[PDB]
């Protein structure tokens, strides 16, 4: 052993589950809402299903300039009206 | 007789906290419709 409490002890203790029957569902719900509120899309810049193309566009918004790439992506996004 | 907040504790939670958050997210994703 190396001094820490056995995991067997911990996970079969009442207190552990009093704590984690709150903390685990809390986290799960947090992640759930991170998706359902749509915040994930905006944090990571991922297209929603209606934001891959403008209505009659069929050309991928591929980044083609290294140093003005940021502005390219921004223009691409404005192009979705 | 035993400590609570150890190097092991930290390690464990650095993995487990985000894992449960993420699993919540992916769960939510299963109900996204185009």
């Amino acid at each position: 052993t190396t001094g820490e409490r056995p995991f067997s002890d911990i996970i079969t203790s009442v207190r552990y589950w009093v704590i984690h029957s709150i903390t685990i569902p809390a986290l799960f719900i947090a992640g759930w809402l991170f998706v359902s509120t749509g915040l994930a899309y905006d944090v990571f810049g991922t297209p929603r299903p209606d934001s891959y193309y403008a209505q009659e566009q069929r050309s991928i918004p591929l980044v083609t300039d290294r140093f003005e790439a940021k502005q390219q992506v921004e223009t691409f996004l404005e192009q979705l009206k | 007789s035993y400590p609570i907040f150890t190097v092991r504790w930290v390690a464990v939670h650095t993995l487990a906290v985000p894992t449960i958050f993420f699993l919540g997210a992916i769960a939510a994703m299963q109900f996204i419709q185009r």
């Binding site: 709150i22 903390t23 809390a26 986290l27 509120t37 | 400590p3």
Partner: peptide, 30 residues
Amino acid sequence: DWRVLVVLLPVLLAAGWAVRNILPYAVKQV
């Protein structure tokens, strides 16, 4: 952004709860 608070309210409620429950043993340890 209200979404970050609606989303990170569960996380901070969890942190607060477990802090509340483990506070005496944490003080005893520290």
